[PDB]
Amino acid sequence: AHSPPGHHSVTGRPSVNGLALAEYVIYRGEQAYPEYLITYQIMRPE
Amino acid sequence: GTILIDLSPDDKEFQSVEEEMQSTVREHRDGGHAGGIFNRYNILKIQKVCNKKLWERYTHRRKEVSEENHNHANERMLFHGSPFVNAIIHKGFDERHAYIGGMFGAGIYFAENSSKSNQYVYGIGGGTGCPVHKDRSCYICHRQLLFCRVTLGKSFLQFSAM
Ligand SMILES: CC(C)(CO)[C@H]1Cc2[nH]c(=O)c3ccccc3c2CO1
Ligand SMILES: [Zn+2]
Numbered sequence: 124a125h126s127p128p129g130h131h132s133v134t135g136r137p138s139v140n141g142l143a144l145a146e147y148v149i150y151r152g153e154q155a156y157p158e159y160l161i162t163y164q165i166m167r168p169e
Numbered sequence: 170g171t172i173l174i175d176l177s178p179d180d181k182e183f184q185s186v187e188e189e190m191q192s193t194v195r196e197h198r199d200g201g202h203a204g205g206i207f208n209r210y211n212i213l214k215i216q217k218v219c220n221k222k223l224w225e226r227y228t229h230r231r232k233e234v235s236e237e238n239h240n241h242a243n244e245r246m247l248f249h250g251s252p253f254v255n256a257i258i259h260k261g262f263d264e265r266h267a268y269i270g271g272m273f274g275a276g277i278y279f280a281e282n283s284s285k286s287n288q289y290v291y292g293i294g295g296g297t298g299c300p301v302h303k304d305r306s307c308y309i310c311h312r313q314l315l316f317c318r319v320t321l322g323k324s325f326l327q328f329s330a331m
Pocket of ligand 2: 299300301302303304307308309310
């Protein structure tokens, strides 16, 4: 797809869950650079 | 042309990235279905991704967007989880990494919550979970996320019912 006319991206902002942070969408691969590669495990709650 | 450089845990840069990761875990409304049940991560490794060609591709576009947006690139650091991570660090982001069914349009998606991106490490909806155990909440297998520099430029604000 393409971004809205006159726009370079979309900001998707949760309006119901007040603890949920934003998500963002770009429509050109060149607008992102993969700066860090993070290797991890999720931890089981104690 | 990609080189991966290990950051030391004693490095402030390593510590800053881990803090971004840990501090942006939240609870999800699927109760952990897609990404698993957890409040924090065990960070095993953080590597800087170095590719001169991919960087110049990025900064060239950043300059275009910046000038189109009146000298404001609106650049962020954001998370991205994907089964395609290893293709991304070598070849860069492209249409193959678009989310066709995304509720904000068919583009490439990034998140401020590390735990939101964790939901996509094994694919949409967490796919079938880790390869080895088929467990979306696996505590054994190693996962990878990208922490990315993203140019937003003029961004359209879409509120969502989430
Ligand atoms: C693997 C694909 C490309 C789908 O084929 C996936 C990657 C992805 N990664 C995120 O971190 C994210 C974060 C928030 C919202 C959506 C996403 C998506 C949606 O697209
Ligand atoms: Zn596993």
